[PDB]
């Protein structure tokens, strides 16, 4: 008797033109710039940027004093702020649109750990936030595709991880036989 009720949702987005010379070129130049793994990821991001603009357009369709806009518009922006996509001095909705996927990509646990000199590379970082080598907030973050919020961008180290805690993984297996 199976009656699930949790919800679906695809984070993907397949492109119409399957072999756009110019499009693929950006996806790769992107995957290499952000240490991505598969084209999927790149679409996952575009799909997200979508929900924002589709909601920006949806709101721009309103009177400037619409009970709805006034409330949802602000709240959407407030969120662009917590994730730091727009700077204090970029309120107005119209700005929600001029958002580079390149900008939204930069606010990831990946893009951050590297740009925080906390790693030797855009890649080095990638295996790190993987091996738990990175804690955020009061919790530990394993998933490289974290949406790093402004407020907590301070709290990002390695709590009780070999590079702060007490290592002995490859070390132990190493020194014991040396004798």
């Amino acid at each position: 008797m199976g009656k699930t009720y949790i919800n679906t949702s695809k984070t993907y987005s397949t492109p119409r033109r399957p072999y756009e010379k110019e499009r693929l070129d950006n996806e790769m130049k992107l995957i290499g710039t952000f240490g991505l793994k598969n084209k999927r990821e790149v679409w996952r991001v575009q799909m997200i940027l979508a929900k924002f603009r589709k909601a920006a357009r949806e709101l721009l369709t309103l009177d400037p004093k619409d009970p709805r806009r006034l409330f949802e518009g602000s709240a959407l922006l407030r969120r662009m702020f917590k994730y730091g996509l727009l700077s204090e001095q970029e309120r107005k909705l119209d700005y929600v649109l001029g958002l580079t996927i390149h900008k939204l990509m930069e606010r990831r646990l990946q893009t951050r750990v590297f740009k925080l000199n906390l790693a030797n590379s855009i890649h080095h970082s990638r295996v790190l936030i993987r091996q738990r080598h990175i804690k955020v907030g009061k919790n530990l973050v394993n998933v490289p595709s974290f949406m790093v919020r402004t407020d907590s961008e301070k709290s990002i180290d390695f709590a009780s991880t070999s590079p702060l805690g007490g290592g002995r993984e490859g070390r132990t297996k190493r020194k014991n036989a040396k004798k």
Partner: protein, 259 residues
């Protein structure tokens, strides 16, 4: 259909119970009582999810079955997992002498108001019907399915009485007429409390009513949904969520996070 329904589905059980969607699959189905299915709060809901005194299902089974009697509804003992406590009721938790009002939010969720041993005495009754029965005698009936014998004669059908539970005595009533205070028991506007403006009857089968309140908002609803919370501006019971008045999603924000 086969006969008469007998269960209830998680999914189908009223949003007034602020229920657990993931919860289970069912939900305690209100027992045929004083209040209608939708307009009620079965005890199990009242203690488990509401007060939180109970918890797991068996938790209740103890409370209402235990030879001690821990739950009182309008000065009476109750031991039914789903007695339909309805609007304007008074529930007492014996073992702690807690007294509550069964009232709707301003957002339409069943809320529990804490009363002082004082209000816990009186309960507000709305008049259902009024006619004379057996051997030349007058009878009045309340939403709370109360049947009254020899009631004051200055009481029209759509009235509101104040009831002294302690003496099962009436006192100070008040009909619905231009210029009173009211609570709306159900509708796209429930939980609101304002001043009655005027009542336009249309007889064709459905009369309407208008209202004002704090921020002087204009309200519209059918009579059957008006409950006279009082006569001439002074309300008769303490209301939940401050005064019976809801805010724009805009006013809520500005009040809380001040935007």
């Amino acid at each position: 259909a086969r006969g008469p329904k007998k269960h209830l589905k998680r999914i189908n059980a009223p949003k007034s119970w602020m229920l657990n969607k993931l919860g289970g699959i069912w939900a305690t189905r209100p027992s045929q009582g004083p209040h209608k299915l939708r307009e009620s709060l079965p005890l199990s809901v009242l203690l488990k999810e509401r007060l939180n005194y109970a918890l797991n299902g068996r938790d209740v089974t103890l409370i209402l079955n235990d030879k001690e009697q821990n739950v009182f509804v309008d000065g009476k003992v109750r031991r039914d997992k789903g007695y339909p406590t309805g609007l304007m009721d008074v529930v007492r938790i014996e073992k702690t002498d807690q007294s509550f009002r069964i009232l709707y939010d301003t957002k339409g969720r069943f809320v529990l108001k804490s009363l002082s041993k004082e209000e816990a005495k009186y309960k507000l009754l709305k008049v259902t019907a009024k006619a004379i029965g057996p051997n030349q005698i007058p009878y009045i009936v309340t939403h709370d399915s109360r049947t009254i014998r020899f009631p004051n004669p200055e009481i029209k059908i759509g009235d509101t009485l104040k009831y002294d539970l302690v003496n099962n005595k009436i006192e100070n009533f008040a009909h619905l007429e231009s210029g009173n205070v009211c609570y709306i028991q159900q509708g796209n506007n429930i939980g609101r409390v304002g001043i009655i403006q005027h009542i336009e009857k249309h007889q064709g089968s459905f009369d309407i009513c208008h209202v004002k309140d704090a921020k002087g908002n204009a309200f519209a609803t059918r009579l059957g949904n008006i409950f006279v919370l009082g006569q001439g501006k002074k309300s008769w019971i303490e209301l939940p969520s401050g005064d019976g008045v809801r805010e724009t999603i805009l006013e809520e924000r500005k009040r809380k996070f001040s935007y």
